[PDB]
Design a protein around this ligand. Structure first.
Ligand SMILES: OC[C@H]1O[C@H](O[C@H]2[C@@H](O)[C@H](O)[C@@H](CO)O[C@@H]2O)[C@@H](O)[C@@H](O)[C@@H]1O
Ligand code: CA
Ligand code: CA
Ligand code: CA
Length: 132
């Protein structure tokens, strides 16, 4: 038994998969479901800080499970949950700007950015860690 699958990362009871290949936003959702997970939905500042740190060091644009596809300007997590006021401090300066229609969120540098959902980027899946 192992709390997390090979190549995954453990943090506060959950396992994260930082992909080494790229996919557009929708295909990233599917990629995570296929491994019993979900395109990362952040539920805490602690989690956000942990993820942001790993992603900035990776120097890779990375998708998260957040979008405003349904209603422009209203960002919602893939778990149907709404983006809380306390998390809006994480957007990069000048973001989200919806330039050229950007409805999917990614980790970019030290914060978040909204980008075109059809662009291929790395992605992070999240699932609960096993105990033993
Ligand atoms: O080129 C830097 C920037 O490019 C992409 O983001 C686009 C857009 O979403 C941004 O708002 C603007 C300004 O930040 O730049 C592009 O037009 C992403 O690859 C992003 O991660 C990157 O920083
Ligand atoms: Ca839109
Ligand atoms: Ca948008
Ligand atoms: Ca943007």
């Amino acid at each position: 038994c192992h709390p997390c699958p090979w190549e995954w990362t453990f943090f506060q009871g959950n396992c994260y998969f930082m992909s080494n290949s790229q996919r557009n936003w929708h295909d990233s959702i599917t990629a995570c479901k296929e491994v019993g997970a979900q395109l990362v939905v952040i539920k805490s500042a602690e989690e956000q800080n942990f993820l942001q740190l790993q992603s900035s060091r990776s120097n890779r644009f990375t998708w998260m499970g957040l979008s405003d596809l349904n209603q422009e300007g209203t960002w919602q997590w893939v778990d149907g949950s709404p983006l809380l006021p306390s998390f809006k401090q994480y957007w990069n300066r000048g973001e989200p700007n919806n330039v050229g229609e950007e409805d999917c969120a990614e980790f970019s540098g030290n914060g978040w950015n909204d980008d075109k959902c059809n662009l291929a980027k790395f992605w992070i899946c999240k699932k609960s860690a096993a105990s033993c």
